[PDB]
Amino acid sequence: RTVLCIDFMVFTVRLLHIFTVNKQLGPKIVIVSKMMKDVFFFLFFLGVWLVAYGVATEGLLRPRDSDFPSILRRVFYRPYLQIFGQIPQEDMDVALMEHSNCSSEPGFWAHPPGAQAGTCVSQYANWLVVLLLVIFLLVANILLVNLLIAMFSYTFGKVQGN
Amino acid sequence: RTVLCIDFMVFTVRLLHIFTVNKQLGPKIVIVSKMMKDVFFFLFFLGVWLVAYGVATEGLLRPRDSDFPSILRRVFYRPYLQIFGQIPQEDMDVALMEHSNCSSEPGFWAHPPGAQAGTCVSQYANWLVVLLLVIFLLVANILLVNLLIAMFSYTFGKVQGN
């Protein structure tokens, strides 16, 4: 079933190839291919920023789960969703979660309510974690996205005639 | 650790400098530097609007916490997140929270459910608080963001050749 579910995706995509003949959708479909260069640049810039912000935030929090699938989710998956409006403040802000002496390791720790946010996170410099979130949202949600719109508009005008 | 977490951010950013040689990403990386003038104007306009809306909303609510870190969070942090789709209606609307006689100071007060929203907020003119939120969202989420896209598109076309 897992192969067929992905297979249905490929079959549905072929509807674009079938409709290339139509005069209304023909030119537009061809232009979409020319836009792939701009998309790859955005992915590269976003990938670099996601690695920098994701690792730094996870390193500052120091969650006690530290499982490899869990670490990957908190480094890549969670920062990625913050671009699209899913900001889990209760998982990264000490002022929202409750303080607990869960971990025997010295320091101050708080218990996030999320299931995959880790059992406990350090409170040492969470003002930096909040500050990093502010910077990340500005760079990713605003600067990077609006930059891609500018490159899409320039490319569309250039390659329209050809 | 706090220094190293920030240090990892600087090291990851250097990947852009390494990839300047590549022909696909070379020109695009150089253009990004030329966009910083437009970003600074947006930050200045947003900073002025955030101060005006943030202080006025906090002044109208008059939360009873009034701690300096708490005041700064409600003035800058909360209005900033409203740009990216995090609107805490239950923290600023009387119609959503429950009425209580928490404060001995004369007036009408309601108890927000949020942890950092303050223990109580005044109900005197919350129709103005809601109205300010409507105006803030229009100016910030729509007018300011779409203006930056227009300036990014104009700048990208101008500085593409050079």
Swiss-Prot record, chains A, B:
Post-translational modification: Phosphorylation by PKC leads to increase the sensitivity to Ca(2+).
Transmembrane segments: 1-19, 40-60, 129-149
Domain of life: Eukaryota
Intramembrane segments: 73-93
Residues carrying a glycan: 101
Result of changing residue 34 to A: Becomes insensitive to decavanadate's voltage modulation effect
Extracellular side: 61-72, 94-128
Tissue specificity remark: Widely expressed with a high expression in intestine and prostate. In brain, it is both expressed in whole cerebral arteries and isolated vascular smooth muscle cells. Prominently expressed in Purkinje fibers. Expressed at higher levels in T-helper 2 (Th2) cells as compared to T-helper 1 (Th1) cells. Expressed in keratocytes.
Topological domains, Cytoplasmic: 20-39
Selectivity filter (motif): residue ranges: 84-86
Consequence of changing residue 158 to A: Becomes insensitive to decavanadate's voltage modulation effect
Consequence the record notes for mutating residue 23 to R: In PFHB1B; atrioventricular block
Outcome of swapping residue 91 to A: Results in a functional channel that exhibits extremely fast desensitization, possibly indicating destabilization of the pore
Cystine residue pairs: 102-120
Consequence of changing residue 93 to A: Results in a non-functional channel with a dominant negative phenotype
Role summary: Calcium-activated selective cation channel that mediates membrane depolarization. While it is activated by increase in intracellular Ca(2+), it is impermeable to it. Mediates transport of monovalent cations (Na(+) > K(+) > Cs(+) > Li(+)), leading to depolarize the membrane. It thereby plays a central role in cadiomyocytes, neurons from entorhinal cortex, dorsal root and vomeronasal neurons, endocrine pancreas cells, kidney epithelial cells, cochlea hair cells etc.
Comment block on domains: TRPM4, is a temperature-sensitive ion channel, it adopts distinct conformations at different temperatures, markedly influencing where and how ligands interact with it. Decavanadate (a positive modulator), ATP (an inhibitor) and Ca(2+) bind to different locations of TRPM4 at physiological temperatures or at lower temperatures.
Family per record: Belongs to the transient receptor (TC 1.A.4) family. LTrpC subfamily. TRPM4 sub-subfamily.
Disease: Progressive familial heart block 1B: A cardiac bundle branch disorder characterized by progressive alteration of cardiac conduction through the His-Purkinje system, with a pattern of a right bundle-branch block and/or left anterior hemiblock occurring individually or together. It leads to complete atrio-ventricular block causing syncope and sudden death. Erythrokeratodermia variabilis et progressiva 6: A form of erythrokeratodermia variabilis et progressiva, a genodermatosis characterized by the coexistence of two independent skin lesions: transient erythema and hyperkeratosis that is usually localized but occasionally occurs in its generalized form. Clinical presentation varies significantly within a family and from one family to another. Palmoplantar keratoderma is present in around 50% of cases. EKVP6 inheritance is autosomal dominant.
Subunit relationships: Homotetramer.
Protein name: Transient receptor potential cation channel subfamily M member 4
Natural source organism: Homo sapiens (Human)
Shown stretch of the complete protein: 892 to 1053 of 1214
